[model samples]
Target: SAYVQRGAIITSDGVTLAESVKQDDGTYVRNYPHDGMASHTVGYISTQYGTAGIESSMNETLTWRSALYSMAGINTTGSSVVLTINSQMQAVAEAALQGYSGSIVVMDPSTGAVLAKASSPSYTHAELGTIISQLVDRTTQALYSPGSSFKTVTLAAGIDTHKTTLDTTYSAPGTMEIGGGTIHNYANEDMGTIPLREAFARSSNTALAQLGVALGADNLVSYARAFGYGTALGQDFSTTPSLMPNPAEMTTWELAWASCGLPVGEHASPAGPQTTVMQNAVIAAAIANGGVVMNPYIVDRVLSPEGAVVSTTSPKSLGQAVSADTAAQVREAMLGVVESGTGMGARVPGVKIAGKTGTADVENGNFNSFFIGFAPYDHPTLVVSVVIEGNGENVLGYGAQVGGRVLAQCLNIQAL
Candidate 1:
């Protein structure tokens, strides 16, 4: 290159992802050692496909008109950027999501550092055209239904508003009619009357649907937004925002449907409340961090070509999504989900895990299953969200297994 156009990119754990070297012809050759390890985050550079991901956002900073120092014998290329992605966890996520069309996002709940983000059916930049659609980062860009996983948000709102408690009781019949719609359980099973926590643990769509109507649409949408549902969560990269329908326009049944994490619109309407995989991680991370929503970031630090650190990313709190006490109650109920409820597939016998399983409807009668939660329950260190898309049978079964793998991997816990 005539001037430095790019530099080194490394992971937080000290591994180089991509680097640029001067060629004999005075041009630079961008070298990716791993070929396509973290393809979506590291991105690609080519005139035919153009630049993408960090390669696009950090393009200017990675490039310079002139070197920081032009003194003789000093070899400085592009400014090096360190990413928060953990290679081991990222690899684990990739392996778990392999053979499936899905995404897994793991984060450090305390710091908002994205530990691992893997979007399945990914493609290597050098060899394209086979799976061109895999270019989009499903973790940050694509939006899907929240399913029962969204119940945590509703639970948070109820507790925070003093409208309900974990011990609050509700009737959960196999099916019930409210507004213009009828609510039914997964198998039309009836639990009669159950407490809020118990209902949440079992993931009762019927009870939660009633809770939503009683809690009202305004309260539900407000909490969703508080969890960063309607906004883009990435601080240093290009991302698409999660969307929520305005409650004002939703019909009575639509609001009830959305309350239980169903789409606000009809059977397969494209315009319904939707959330990205990244937002799901942040939401679970918020609960792990005691309801303080931290803004997630990709780049951890920027080092000058001279090997000196120029800038570093610090965790910033977006706002309080809910009170610590409120989060504690929800945390207890989430623990119930794993200990005695619908998320048992993710259980590690000796460990305490708090989580929620989501199975929402999708196009062509397929379903997107989700598992969002954190582990080492007392003091959480990892926040993981697993999404298995377009396979109804995977049905939170794969999601729970994949999510359990990462949660167990973190503490080196085994399934007893």
Candidate 2:
């Protein structure tokens, strides 16, 4: 008895990462040339463990039909899958996350083509047999509290519903009581009364919590759903949707915290509302790409064994989550974030970056540093999202540092 071999999987630059070779013994064996670089994305196939990753998702295309090919007297081969991944970009993303337990997601906002999805603490394909636990792609599967980075959603909702404006004044004291909880700014510093735009740039939790109360649960849930939260992003692989509080049972305290990207009560853990790295990128991409959320895709195109194009992916809009005017306002606010706020660490030289930084407190007294942004702000190109977890200390700026380097490299590669 014999089994059909799997087809080849290559990167955008035509570099083969995975393939199968026929042995003289009348059997096939799969090979992974690139060790750990793209293990999660490319996946693996084995006689004992079967298949996973892209191998599992595109199994039909990957398996060669031995009987059909024999009848046609044709060379047995399966279709090839071309990924949107760029090796250089992937390297930069992975390098940026060195010595960290985190994940990075970089994508083209216009087309929703994923350029890099890097997860740290990774194991190579060679170790798959020994380390079955590290196989998950944390970029889409793992979720954590978004922290202040989620203020972008609240800001967008506020502008879209006409509940607030850039100049909407809010009293930003060191702390404020709302929904039976005390919401304070980072470090509880008082910035006094500031404009909404400035508060966002400053990431003032006090101001944002007030805005969430103003928007109310109904408005917040509507905008969150519009922004692709609480629903699957519809990626080719499995994806965990970014969560939002259930409006029906949301307490005022929950709404207040949720407004600032920290939800409590039902479905809320001590860490807050959980969101994946992919959702963070989507949130920034929506604002960068004129209020439209593009359905993210990994496979750029599919090719037949003879090199004929089987299919290609086009830019498909998820929907208009916000009006162009509202997007513009949010864009400007994010620009403020990078220009003179907590996200200033992510600003690149001669390139205007628009972004937000988030520092969510988690269990074990650790913190999750999150950064979500897009750049050359006026005409955006790449959307980058990073979340570094298990920080021993409150190094809130670490995410920006990692994200900034990757974004700059992307700009340099494109000469933009």
Candidate 3:
């Protein structure tokens, strides 16, 4: 009957910016504080993909009417949905990111059961039943670059293909070019010599692009598909396909830019529909599991509204998309990154956290920084991805650093 809602309009004092407006028809809109830090997980309502986040994912629940409770001719069976979301962890993250426009997604790498996923400035559930047009605006539906966060996928593909070993060494002037387009280090500086492992820790676009060329566009595209890009996720639930451009259309230079996540435009000549933030989190989870993409689930059990268990969660492995050996290599590489790279901010006490950070430049705005990781590096059970965008007014010039801080904040809060 209803759909996902719009994001939170929070005040500097950490309260939701809300007010009750009396309409001309004598009706009142009692807007409340909602999804201040967890809006992404709740998602917005829409006809295009249906509502997203919890509202859409669990729509069958909110709209569900118990058939069992009805007379034989009236209805058949109805149940209540239960969630595995760790409310404690979610609250911790929200408090840590009260003033930012960021997103956080957590999953059981082994099972793909989404534990918690939240985003800043998320649409409110109250906004859904009344005004869906505003919910569909570009402000909430637009796409941004994934930045260094994408490096995790690239590195995962590299390990899967065996083109480069974690110990493979290369020299870097901290900058390189493709088809004459020069790419530089963060400060336009250079590192003398490093291994592929160190390159990942450092989030080096140059070394990675070199490996991408060596691996060839075909391999890159193949890995992208294996990781669930460019196609529907095929989960029992609904999901949109990730937007992956055709590698065939990319020349050497274009391919290089693609490696760094700066391809054409969103519609640059050849582009596909983009994936939702939730979809990207699933992909990251697949890598964390060493290539096994788990079909995601939120409801742990469906209970009859009358109080009977209709179903319970059973872990299912989608398939082995990457070899176990490849997963090991990728895990090692990511560990290096967290130990001494751009993701250093994500280090957690007593837990081996290995992750990748991404920061993309947005139009007329600052960069969007993202982080994706799994815990206990050797036997990762949890994977998390976070992204922080630059609001129109402020330039998040330190996208990577800022993203790292958020990642660390989440770890400290969740201890996952």
lDDT per prediction? Answer: 0.82, 0.84, 0.60
True-structure RMSD, every candidate: 3.4, 2.6, 7.1
Q: What TM value does model 2 have?
A: 0.94
Query: On a 0 to 100 scale, what is the lDDT of residue 222 in model 1?
Result: 86
Please give, for residues 1-416, the per-residue lDDT of candidate 2 as tens digits.
13456678888878888888877665677787877787778876577656667888887887745446333324556788989988888888988877888899999998888998888878887776674536557898888888899899999999998988999899998899998888888888999989999999999999999998999988888887787777677466667888766677788888888888886767443323578889889889999999998888888888988899899977788899999999999999999988998888998888898899998878889888999999888899899999988657667699998888899998887673
Which is superior by lDDT, 1 or 2? 2
Which regions of candidate 1 deviate over 4 angstroms?
1-5, 64-76, 129-131, 266-271, 391-396, 413-416
Q: Evaluate model 3: give its lDDT.
A: 0.60
| Tens-digit lDDT string for candidate 3 (77-114) | 22345555555555654554467666566677778776
Tens digits of per-residue lDDT for model 1 on 254-353? Answer: 8777877888575432444588889888899999999999889989999988789999999888899999999888888999998898888899888898
Query: How far off is residue 168 in model 1, in Å?
Result: 1.4
User: How many clashing residue pairs are found in candidate 2?
Assistant: 0
TM-score (all chains, Cα) for each model: 0.93, 0.94, 0.77
